[PDB]
RNA sequence: AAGGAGUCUAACAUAUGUGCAAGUUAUUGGGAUAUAAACCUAAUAGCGUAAUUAACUUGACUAAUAAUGGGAUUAGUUUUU
RNA sequence: CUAACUGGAACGUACCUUGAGCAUAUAUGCUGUGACCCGAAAGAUGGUGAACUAUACUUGAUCAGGUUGAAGUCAGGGGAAACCCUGAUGGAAGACCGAAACAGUUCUGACGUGCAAAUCGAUUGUCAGAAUUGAGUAUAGGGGCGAAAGACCAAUCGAACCAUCUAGUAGCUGGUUCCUUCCGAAGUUUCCCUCAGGAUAGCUGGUGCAUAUAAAUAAUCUUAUCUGGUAAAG
RNA sequence: AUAUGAAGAUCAAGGUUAUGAUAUAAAUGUCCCAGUGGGCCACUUUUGGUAAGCAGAACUGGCGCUGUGGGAUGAACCAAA
RNA sequence: GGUACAAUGGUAUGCGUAGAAGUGUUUGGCGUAAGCCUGCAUGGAGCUGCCAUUGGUACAGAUCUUGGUGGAUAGUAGCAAAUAAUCGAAUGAGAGCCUUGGAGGACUGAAGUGGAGAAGGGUUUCGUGUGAACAGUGGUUGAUCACGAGUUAGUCGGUCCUAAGUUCAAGGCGAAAGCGAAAAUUUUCAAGUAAAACAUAAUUUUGAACGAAAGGGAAUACGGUUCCAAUUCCGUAACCUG
RNA sequence: UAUCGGAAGAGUUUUCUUUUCUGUUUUAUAGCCGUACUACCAUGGAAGUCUUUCGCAGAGAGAUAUGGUAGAUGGGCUAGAAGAGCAUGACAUAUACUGUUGUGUCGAUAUUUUCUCCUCGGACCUUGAAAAUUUAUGGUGGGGACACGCAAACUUCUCAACAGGCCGUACCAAUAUCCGCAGCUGGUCUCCAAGGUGAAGAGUCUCUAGUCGAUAGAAUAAUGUAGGUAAGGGAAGUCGGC
RNA sequence: AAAGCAUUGUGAUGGCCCUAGCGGGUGUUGACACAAUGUGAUUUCUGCCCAGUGCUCUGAAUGUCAAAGUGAAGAAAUUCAAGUAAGCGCGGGUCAACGGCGGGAGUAACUAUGACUCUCUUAAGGUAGCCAAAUGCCUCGUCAUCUAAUUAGUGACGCGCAUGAAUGGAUUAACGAGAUUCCUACUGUCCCUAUCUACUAUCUAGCGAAACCACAGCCAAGGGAACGGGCUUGGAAUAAUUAGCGGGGAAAGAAGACCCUUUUGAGCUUGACUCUAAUCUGGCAGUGUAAGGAGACAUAAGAGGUGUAGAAUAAGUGGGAG
RNA sequence: GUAUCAUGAUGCAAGCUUCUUGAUCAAAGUAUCACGAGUACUCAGGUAUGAUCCAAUUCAAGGACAUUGCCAGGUAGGGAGUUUGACUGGGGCGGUACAUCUCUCAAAUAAUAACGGAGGUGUCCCAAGGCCAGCUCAGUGCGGACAGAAACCACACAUAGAGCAAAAGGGCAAAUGCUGACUUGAUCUCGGUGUUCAGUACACACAGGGACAGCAAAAGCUCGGCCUAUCGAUCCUUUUGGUUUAAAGAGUUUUUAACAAGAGGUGUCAGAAAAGUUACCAUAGGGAUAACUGGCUUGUGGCGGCCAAGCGUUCAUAGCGACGUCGCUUUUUGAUCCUUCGAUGUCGGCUCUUCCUAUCAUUGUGAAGCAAAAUUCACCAAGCGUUGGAUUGUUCACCCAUGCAAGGGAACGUGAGCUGGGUUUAGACCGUCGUGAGACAGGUUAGUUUUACCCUACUAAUGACAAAACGUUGUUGCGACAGCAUUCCUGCGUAGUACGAGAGGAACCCGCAGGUACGGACCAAUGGCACAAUACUUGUUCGAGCGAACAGUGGUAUGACGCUACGUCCGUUGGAUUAUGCCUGAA
């Protein structure tokens, strides 16, 4: 045989699941009840806070409820220059200024934008992490059907009824620090999952890995592979378009 | 010191024993009783008495009296001189 | 006309040429059954284990004494300014030395039918850390788990353990149990995924049977005849 | 062109079975019966190899399977089973 | 062809507590041989010759199997890590021990060889008695052996709460077992009432339970007491819950 | 823990030593008064800036200052406390089933080394549990209460009466109670923690406590195991300063 | 392992992975993320090659080409026939994908050497560097250094068996129970051994195993299965024992873990032979309601269709002889 | 409320929470019945409204696509199972000795082996088959313009010297060769035989019978190739063939089947369908089989003896010694496969002992082209000796050095003697190779070395009963036998002597004085070890004070006795006589 791979190993739960014991509780916009499509809601921000793991600051914004006689407290994901004591208002008829949130159609074009909404009403999917923001592109005013533009360089056709929350995302931008040190990696990880201290395949044995095995340490086969080639192969460079290094221009706008 | 390794069974072959012999073998059953034995027995069936041919067909000379017809080699026989 | 029968052959045959069989016993022999007895590494099915160890999670616990002296702060000097320079303060760092604790380098020391199926002694590594640790909890076998050695998963691991299939198979090793009498081998032939093995023929024995108060034949010489290309000869 | 061939089937006529020595009884079937299918040594002849207590063959005799006498000793030599 | 073993069918008007089988043996023999017959000694209730038919039928070997035993060897195997005991006395059958008490020299040296707990253990604790075996020497002692006893709570714990997680609940699925599912299944699946009016009327679905003698979590301390138990008994003074 | 005094005993005394030693105690619970530090309040208005820490930290968003409040943090007085009880100590009373007199007092160290309490910080692409349980506040209704006095109060106050079931609990916790086949130099979670030296929970030595348990005796050959020392030379040894 | 560095996939009806089936993990996730891999701090750099192989591309559409569907022949079975999906083939991209990175002659005033020329080829001919290296066979290379003496060390040199750039090249401070060399200090490592201590061993009293064993146990020579304790011939041969010893007993331990053989295995690999999960692709079903182009099949119908001749031009016209 | 509208039409917009970390929950109002106990009075709820109305599908994206169900193609070492020929002077590698043909081996019938030797086969052929007739070939000689070493024509000789698809062999001349003639017998059938052999198969050959045909006037006998090679089972598929047999209820046609004869193919050729690697490895065995020891063997090296070309000024052998020749030597080194695979520990070094002589040195000698010195050759000869280092794991060789002088080997000597550096398991890295797993006889680094207590042997220790040239128990002796030991160098004198033209020069013989190594003792001196004797001293402890203690010897210092070298003392003597030189003395 071999035996099961160590990328194969990851899906089946058991050390490899996340680690949301202190994690701080789901964070996501609010429901598109009939404030959220008729005017406003106000909500003021309580604290923030920080989840563990995720990288960017949370905020504990109370709103009150419209039907029920309680006061909602919503996970949002901050926007960078929220603070405590200031006023948050969702809807259709926000105003424009960080961090509302409000439909996409309700904006000027070139809008910097976070915590969008992939399909309608499903509580903030996309430009979360921790520095990353949407960009209004362009309506297409009737057909309702904004183009914005994702951190990945690539261009999405959203609707114009969901929601997006204006303002880049707080707490970037990490990933400039260097780590410096393995051991502030375990830290980093140890709140997330066991993607591990990485052992390389190719210092494996050939059992436990399609790269592990000869005296001399090397691949010893082409390291792209097929896209529809079905696990324990892929390996390596899932279905890759290149290789190399780009020596050349191709950001995609 | 005790235990410890060519067996049982199915099927066939040759050989020898035994019974009956164009036969043979009741042994699945049924009877009759005396006891898992022994006894009697119907109708079948197996094998044999007829083969061959892929099959369809066909099927072993006028011995009512010639052992295979004829020949050769032939133990024996009031044979027979 | 539609049809059947009739003539001569040759060749073939597990057939015929006036029945000899069937039932049963016993020995031998070939075959299939655990198959003379013992013996594998395996392979399948269903189970059992994380009391060791691995990793992860939850909730706890614990780590002398010193060394060194980062930013921040203070007071002085100096300079047109920019800003330098001296003292102190302070007490960071997967920093150092080392006790506990955790480890296992070297002696290739002791011991090596041991105190001990991994220990003893001395030297050494680390010691506030990606540190050590208890209980609970998770992951289970072609599976897990791995800072990765094919390591570890209860003294078991390049597929754990248990029970069954299973008396698995073995052209291979080993053993195969009373006496006397008589007869007495083979290591060659052909063929075989055959070369440590068969089947085959030869060699052996047993059991008969056909012929006992020549001119039947059969085997080494002489005779007759045919054959031969080696020694020698050239 | 011979129902003279050539084969065959019959009657005729033929002293003294037509070298030697032998007869362990020979002939013929069946169990295709068991074991065996590693051989090895020697004279003589041989091939390869520098050679070999090496490799490979022909011939007959041996050891294997065999004691005993001789070669001090010894599978095989000499003698004798 | 012959001989050993065990049986079955016949048979010997067989043998036997006046001594069968077995065993032992310088009793005497027979057989080429396997083996057989016999005397004596032990033994105490069964057994043999013949004809047939048999069978789990004969052992030196299998690093055979079970059991027992010998040398080696009463030992140059050994009982040498952790400093160390000695005097005198009593007891006793016997004393270097652990047996005791006295004196005395020493060690652990408190990061202990001191004093307590958690796992685990399960009566080992304690008193008296003690004989073999065990304590790799001894043993009058013992965690041994016999007998008798001993563990007391409103306050210490458990129990209660959840964690990581787990077991189940019919969406489901699978031939089923069961998912080495985690079901999150599920018409009112859950609450609520000094309980109502032209629906009585306001509200909520992650069901459920387990999982911490170290997390969370009401309340107690002292002095005394026993051969053996104490934040538990006794006395005294408090405290919590209802 | 250590110093120094007082009262009461003890130890040494040939010589010295107003010596050396020992003990010299006060639970839970609760009434009081105060304090370490922190926050706050009133007054008032700061540059010529000041208050302040080991450290920085703070102030026209109100400093210094003076007077108050809170946190009874963590302590002293009293109650428990019966010259209690306890402990040290002077007599008396035979097991004749018991009484008694005295003591228990001052001061002050430094514990970076213990435990707690409070403060103020730092490291972090690491931000450091959940639930029962409990309280305060707020809200609409609704409840009560009336003076010529009768009351009240699941009453968040004081006291009284009654009750508190189940199960564990002894002992060991390891050179002999557990795992390793064993009375096995192995392994196995914590708590307390004296003095002298000293930087020190080091090493060495000692007090409390504990123990002398490791078969003994004789002798001290070879070879060993552990430990020393060595003239002159100095790595010539050795694969290699092992 | 790491930090740094780079590449890959993924905008969610997604990527990756589990699952028998349902369903789940990442995911309390959302490109500064998740997942997949290589390289391995910093410094300095990272040459050329897309021929082979792998990966990849609306994209090349017709070489291949499945079942289903459709057409034809036959009494049917059925046989032929078109059009056919992915994949392949063809085309493009890509090397911090897997990997690779050449010879032969002739020439400069003594010789020597080859800046230069010609030519054969390749996808590209090994660049910057570096080197007898932990990588150089020859080999103990050659020169220097280090020593009295160096197959070692260090510095160079370079046609380099067989160096070479994230298959990472060249360095590099601090750090190391890593490998190596030299000098100092130091010593019993040595010359070259001696002695002292503890505990053994030892002797005793008590207690008491095991491994092992054909029989056993002095050799020399011979012969022998080619190295005898035993046989043959010699030499020789006296009990019972103590502590040592390590020649022998081809001593013990352990059915050689090396080699070979077995028509015995296992682990791992690969396009070995044959399969398979998953995946992609086509078809059918569930699978409905419409419009607009569809190819007007067929139907509710309609007219027109052209030899000599004759009334001419009857698509055709016979019943017909008014 | 804005364009647009004289007050309405009419599109467009809206009807309300954005200065500030407060708070909101439970309807007030009107509307409407209610107008009820009490007598004018304490004393009351519903619905609508506030909060417009009607629809209904909780909204939102997809949407007849996805998904799923079932077939079809593709991809797929993720995964499964399985296989990787034999032979073989071990196996892998090479090859094919595997099916076959000829010559030889092969020893005069036939048979006959090796990875013996020399080659051949897997085809070619409408003629190169069949048959008649005619013809003579290799070469050679004399000739014939161009024309020669050869062109062609022609004569004479030609035993096959040619030719025959033939690899070799046999064979062959009015042919089996060369040329023409017609031709299809390279046909159909049925057995039988030879070879190989088991007396099986195929296949190849043969000899016949039955046809039908070719050539020839005819006899003739043509059944492929002049002869010896040129090839293939079952199952399957597929033709030809009867003018067929069956499909089992019966006819008919298609289909299928069956039977006869071919073809399609098994080259491992009597005929599986088949790639690696294992250093992570397992099992059964094997001394039928390698790796080391032992045995035989010696091509390779060297060491000897004959002959003497010659070298050596002259001289064949003072010293050599060509071309030949005959031996010895296995250890290197092959070759071998006999013993061992239920295991003989596998290189070196260290340690330690013994043996050989193939003699380096020394003793005793003989010889030189020997004056002396130094050397060379040889003889008797194995007694003593044959060292210290640098580099390398080495082993030889080399280097520094000492040395009068620096010989060669044996028990593969020696791992329960050690060491563990080489080599050699699992870890790891590089270079080349491989697609890979992996390989390397290339480098590098790290990597458990077990047991004696048995018997001998050896070394030391005791030692009885008996037998006894004779008891017990002491004392003094004896020697058989076994052991066996000393050794080389130096310096003075000899002596600047002999010798030599000189230069150089006998440390000659002998005498003397020492040293090396080894041996056997010893301790007066000196050196080393510590009466744990004594002094001091650190820490603790005893109230202080001592020739107290503890710290497994606290530490330092001196240190008798004793042991001990690094010191001291001692270390021998005769006989037969080998090599050689002679005497006497012949045959």
Redesign the pocket.
Known sequence: ????????????????????????????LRSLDF?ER?????G???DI????????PLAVVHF?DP?????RKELF?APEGMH????V?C?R???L?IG?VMPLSQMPEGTIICNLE?????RG????????YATVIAHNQDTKKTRVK?????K?VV?S?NRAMVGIVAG?????????????????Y??????????????????????????????????????????????????????????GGKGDS
């Open positions: 045989m071999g035996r099961v791979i160590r990328a194969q190993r990851k899906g089946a739960g058991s050390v490899f699941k996340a680690h949301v014991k202190k994690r701080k509780g789901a964070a996501k404030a008729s005017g406003y809601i106000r003021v921000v309580k806070i920080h989840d563990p793991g995720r990288g960017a009150r039907y029920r006689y309680k006061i994901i405590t004591g200031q006023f208002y809807g008829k926000a105003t200024q509302n992939e399909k309608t009403g499903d999917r996309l430009a979360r992490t921790s520095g990353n994702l951190p990945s360089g690539a999405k609707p009824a970037g931008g990490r990933i400039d620090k260097p780590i410096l040190k393995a051991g502030r990696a375990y830290h980093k140890k709140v997330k999952r066991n993607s591990w201290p990485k052992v390389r395949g190719v210092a494996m044995n050939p059992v436990e890995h399609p790269h592990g095995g000869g005296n001399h340490q090397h691949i010893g086969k082409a390291s792209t592979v097929k896209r529809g080639t079905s696990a324990g192969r892929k390996v390596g460079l899932i279905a890759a378009r290149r290789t190399g290094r780009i020596r």
